[PDB]
Amino acid sequence: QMSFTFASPTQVFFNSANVRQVDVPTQTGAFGILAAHVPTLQVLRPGLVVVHAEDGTTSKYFVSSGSVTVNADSSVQLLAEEAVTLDMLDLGAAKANLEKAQSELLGAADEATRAEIQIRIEANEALVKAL
Template identity: 60%
Template sequence: MFSRAALSAIRHVPRFGTRAYADAPMAFTFASQSQVFYNAANIRQVDVPSFSGSFGILPSHVPSLAVLKPGVMTVFESDGTTKKFFVSSGIVTINEDSSVQILAEEAAGIEELDLSAARDVLSKAQSAASSATSEETKAEALIAVEVAEALVKAAESG
């Protein structure tokens, strides 16, 4: 009963404007400590992994700030091509003017990842976690394991 009342109320709410996602420009800047991948480039969409869940960013997105978690970020360019990047951590800023900045601690194109090297990094991180003697060392090693697991998963998908 409540859901019918809510649905009927929703139908009668006036609409004040529309969003034109496909036509709106979205200036996108994406960089790591060692490389700039995009500098105010016009893109259609970017999907990012964050600690609050993975989400897509389109033009006219609500201004937000999010922390990246290790994983794959997908950029949908204005010409229809798609590029995927591994990001270890970082920050996403979505501004009121539809510009988006992503600053990653470390980033690389998926095609650049070496699966055997990623597995080696994971193995070493797991060894460090199992042999850690202090809480601080163990916490650092577990973070390295989380990043390495995401790196292996990204390398397998590429």
């Protein structure tokens, strides 16, 4: 088991819940968080939290960013800046956003500009993943 604390500022989704495993889009990339945990620190990327709750059921989220905190403990802490269930996101919009993102990039011309835009692209695209 792993006590998964999955929370965002806004809410706690899982709170030290004996979830078997959670698959996260750390900025490391993907990652399959299992029952006990490494002392490891991870950074969250825009991708999904799929919370394989020790019961077969798994909840989905897309998380933008934040941290997973990977304890020596079986306690796993997803502190997502925001991780939302995709439920509250909209595909149509996603497209529109991505379009914009892609539109913007083209005039993004300071590294930072590019980068942020790219965040949008990347992000928006990454919403499209599961939207």
